[PDB]
Amino acid sequence: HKCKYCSKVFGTDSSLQIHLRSHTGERPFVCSVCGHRFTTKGNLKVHFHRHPQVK
Amino acid sequence: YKHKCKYCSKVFGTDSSLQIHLRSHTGERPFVCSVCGHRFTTKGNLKVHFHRHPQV
DNA sequence: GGAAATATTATATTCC
DNA sequence: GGAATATAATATTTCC
Ligand SMILES: [Zn+2]
Ligand SMILES: [Zn+2]
Ligand SMILES: [Zn+2]
Ligand SMILES: [Zn+2]
């Protein structure tokens, strides 16, 4: 499960290529109101709670 | 800039950003939690952590 | 201009 | 075991 780029290795594959996105620049999670893109869903979840809501 | 870390020699824009960075070497965690005793290297990191403790 | 806060990003660690 | 939550470091933005 080792990073082909930085010689780091994790216990899971899911953790492995969340890490890869820090190398390849892939950012699959996108904010509906803003267009800014993130590497993980939790990040965008944090960044989303900064846009004022409307419900 | 003029402010360089004496451990990793990465330069920082302003001395106050350097003193926070040095805490990532010394392990000095000044800011402590009122409810749970967990110590944090910055006031901000303590804020995002404190704001989940249900109610005081 | 510089300190402080806020937003950001990567990852370890719980959760499910 | 993947997904969520917490976390730590720093880049960006706000305030002064
Ligand atoms: Zn890597
Ligand atoms: Zn947005
Ligand atoms: Zn350093
Ligand atoms: Zn606490």
PDB file of C-alpha atoms in Angstrom, chain B residues 34-36 49-56:
ATOM      1  CA  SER B  34     -11.502  24.413  29.680  1.00  0.00           C
ATOM      2  CA  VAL B  35     -13.456  21.151  29.817  1.00  0.00           C
ATOM      3  CA  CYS B  36     -11.106  18.347  28.848  1.00  0.00           C
ATOM      4  CA  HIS B  49     -12.008  21.802  19.077  1.00  0.00           C
ATOM      5  CA  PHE B  50     -13.861  23.688  21.811  1.00  0.00           C
ATOM      6  CA  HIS B  51     -16.864  24.361  19.558  1.00  0.00           C
ATOM      7  CA  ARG B  52     -17.913  20.705  19.640  1.00  0.00           C
ATOM      8  CA  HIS B  53     -18.002  20.374  23.425  1.00  0.00           C
ATOM      9  CA  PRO B  54     -21.802  20.431  23.836  1.00  0.00           C
ATOM     10  CA  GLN B  55     -22.513  23.303  26.232  1.00  0.00           C
ATOM     11  CA  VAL B  56     -20.945  25.445  28.952  1.00  0.00           C
TER      12      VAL B  56
END
